[PDB]
């Protein structure tokens, strides 16, 4: 499959902000989680058919500590604590990925900060669906 990129600029967010400070993001911005628990980002992701899809986040984590997130798909928690480990700098971007089942149609995919320092900075969500 070819990737479909769900850009930060198009995200639905909570206790998080669209930011452009740190170089190396793609599109027009990335999302920042406000250095606290509970914020999220979410997109409406089309699946042309039911099955397994790769969900890849491009992110930065300029701290030394893991910033894990809960991944929810259509209201069900598919990954209670997905790791987002240090990338070494706020300007160094890496990828983290999982596989999840999507339904034919729209899928609401959310990444929620579960740790006290919030989520990493997230560039986009890439889904191998096309
Ligand atoms: Ca971006």
């Amino acid at each position: 499959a070819s990737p479909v990129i769900y850009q930060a600029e198009d995200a639905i967010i909570y206790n998080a902000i669209l930011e452009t400070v740190n170089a190396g993001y793609t599109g027009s911005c990335y999302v920042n989680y406000h250095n606290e628990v509970g914020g999220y980002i979410e997109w409406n992701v089309n699946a042309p058919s039911s099955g397994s899809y790769a969900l890849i986040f491009r992110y930065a984590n300029g701290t030394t500590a893991n910033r894990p997130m809960r991944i929810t798909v259509n209201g069900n928690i598919v990954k209670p604590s997905m790791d987002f480990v240090s990338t070494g700098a706020w300007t160094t971007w890496n990828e983290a990925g999982i596989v999840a089942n999507l339904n034919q149609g729209n899928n609401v995919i959310r990444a929620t900060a579960i740790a006290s320092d919030g989520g990493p900075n997230v560039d986009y969500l890439k889904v191998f669906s096309a």
Side-chain angles (χ1 to χ4, degrees), residues 5-10 19 24-31 43 58 93 122-125:
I5 302 167
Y6 291 88
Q7 312 285 345
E9 53 266 30
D10 295 320
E19 191 171 301
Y25 64 85
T26 61
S28 71
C29 73
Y30 62 87
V31 181
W43 292 267
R58 182 171 191 266
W93 304 83
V122 175
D123 193 21
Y124 58 65
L125 166 65

Side-chain angles (χ1 to χ4, degrees), residues 22-86:
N22 299 123
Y25 64 85
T26 61
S28 71
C29 73
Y30 62 87
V31 181
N32 172 278
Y33 284 80
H34 260 339
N35 286 122
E36 76 199 341
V37 72
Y40 66 71
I41 69 185
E42 79 173 20
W43 292 267
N44 289 118
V45 173
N46 188 252
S49 61
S50 301
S52 293
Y53 292 77
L55 308 177
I56 290 146
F57 298 90
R58 182 171 191 266
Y59 81 99
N61 178 359
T63 82
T64 65
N66 185 26
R67 287 191 172 197
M69 300 202 284
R70 171 192 296 152
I71 313 299
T72 311
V73 177
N74 300 139
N76 291 337
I77 298 175
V78 300
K79 184 73 173 293
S81 186
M82 179 176 175
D83 297 325
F84 292 89
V85 304
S86 191

